[PDB]
């Protein structure tokens, strides 16, 4: 099994210099708590949660809708190859303390998958 | 085993008026991701999570210099007495599907406790 198997493919990346009451937007829309953050042609720059709006945000002083989201992402980077195990997912997910991880194949944002992915295709 | 027995004691409830900019701060400050907020009379208003601030501040419009703790809390209520059992904080843990609960005593928050915390002394 490999993660382009059981990840959730086709999720759109926020543009970095969307501003973070934007992302907050997005984040409501589809009620999670960590988006994939991307430059020009899908080029992963981070990962931007909800926490970091509001503790490398709106406590740091940052206007939330003049900084963005590529602001924040990017003190965030961390990732696995679309051909990645489930082991390997799982170190990452360790390492970072996160629940999601930004899956990428020749450099661009295929998709994400979540731990719970993980549990679900085990067998 | 009760609550006064594993909860975080003297943490100090944050003002209703206090805005979203501050309780972000206070957030920070203790790395912590949920506050309780109090009213002038010194009770328990609610609880304000930091996704609450960024969901049902940022997210609906809202000037997290101006929106205010209490507005973001007022839905959000939920307690334990000091004197209550592990089964009672799981009860609210579990029917309000959160994981830091107040503690009050003589109309006072007194603590704060939180899954780990139970987790910790169970």
Redesign the interface.
Request: proline share 6%; net charge positive.
């Given at each position: 099994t490999t993660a382009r198997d059981i990840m959730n493919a086709g999720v759109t990346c926020v543009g970095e210099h969307e501003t973070?009451?934007a992302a907050?937007?997005y984040?409501?829309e589809h009620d999670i708590?960590a988006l994939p953050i991307c430059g020009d042609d899908d080029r992963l720059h981070g990962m931007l949660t909800?926490?970091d709006?509001?503790?490398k945000?709106?406590?740091?002083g940052l206007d939330?809708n003049t900084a963005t989201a590529g602001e924040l992402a990017r003190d965030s980077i961390y990732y696995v190859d679309a051909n990645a195990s489930i082991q390997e997912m799982l170190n990452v997910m360790e390492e970072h303390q996160v629940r999601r991880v930004p899956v990428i194949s020749e450099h661009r944002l295929v998709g994400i998958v979540t731990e719970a992915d993980i549990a679900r295709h085990l067998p």
């Open positions: 973070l009451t907050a937007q984040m409501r708590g909800d926490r709006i509001v503790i945000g709106l406590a740091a939330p």
